[PDB]
Amino acid sequence: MGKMEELVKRAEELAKEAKEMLEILKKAHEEGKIDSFLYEALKEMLESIKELAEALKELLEHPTGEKHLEALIKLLKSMVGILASMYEIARYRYLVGQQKQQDPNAPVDPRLPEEAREEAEKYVKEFEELVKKLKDSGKLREVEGLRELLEFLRELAEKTLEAAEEYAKLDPDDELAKGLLEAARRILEALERALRAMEETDEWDLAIAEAAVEIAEAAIELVIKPVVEKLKE
Ligand SMILES: [Cl-]
Ligand SMILES: [K+]
Ligand SMILES: [K+]
Ligand SMILES: [K+]
């Protein structure tokens, strides 16, 4: 099989895993076994991984035309969704952990989950606005438009890495923090390689698809799977 076909096979394996983890996490949440904020963010992350695998299949099937651009856009948006859900968890866990350090005697702050969610949702909205702007100018159909979208993803990956770093510095024994940090490192590395690949040749579809699969693999293996495994024990 060609490279793009191998990438779709891998993404479909990840989507299969994601559907199964969604079922396990839902039962765990109904049984009082997982925190609601973490559950809701992992659920969003898994749904982005399912969408990524769908867009990748469409990209393989539509190398040209409007369906090609729509598959590329859907694929990039699902990558943004995975990073924003990672950012949401790291930010929320950090804010809660910081309050414990600065003032352990204070009551639960209701603003913290709302603050983490609002910040992560802003990135999703900003990306949708950027896509619309490039689509209106026509720049979306040129290589410079795709670079601008990948540069946005790289900046989001850097912000996600910073959030994961701050969270991991609070508790070095926190395994979820360690998984978010390593995933954020791999995701940033994958996007920096994709930006390099897009300058070296015209294989733009392969560059983005490769980054997309690496991003979903990192999230599944390093962030989601260990939480699910702990619930199984
Ligand atoms: Cl206090
Ligand atoms: K407190
Ligand atoms: K959301
Ligand atoms: K940690």
Numbering used by the authors: 0 to 232
Can you provide the manuscript's text about this entry?
Here we use a robust deep learning pipeline to design complex folds and soluble analogues of integral membrane proteins. Unique membrane topologies, such as those from G-protein-coupled receptors, are not found in the soluble proteome, and we demonstrate that their structural features can be recapitulated in solution. Biophysical analyses demonstrate the high thermal stability of the designs, and experimental structures show remarkable design accuracy. The soluble analogues were functionalized with native structural motifs, as a proof of concept for bringing membrane protein functions to the soluble proteome, potentially enabling new approaches in drug discovery.
Then, we tested our design approach in one of the most prevalent membrane folds in nature: the GPCR fold. De novo design of GPCR-like folds (GLFs) offers the potential to create new small-molecule receptors and protein scaffolds with functional sites of GPCRs. We tested 56 designs, of which 36 were expressed to be soluble, and we selected the ten most highly expressed designs for further biochemical characterization. Of these ten designs, nine were monodisperse monomers in solution, and all showed the characteristic circular dichroism signature of α-helix-rich proteins. All ten designs also showed high thermal stabilities (Tm > 90 °C). Last, the designed GLFs preserved the canonical seven-helical bundle characteristic of native GPCRs. This accuracy further extended to the side-chain level, for which comparisons of crystal structures versus design models for GLF_18 and GLF_32 showed 1.54 and 1.40 Å r.m.s.d.fa values, respectively. Comparing the structures of the soluble analogues with that of the reference native GPCR, the overall backbone r.m.s.d.Cα values were 3.08 and 3.51 Å for GLF_18 and GLF_32, respectively.
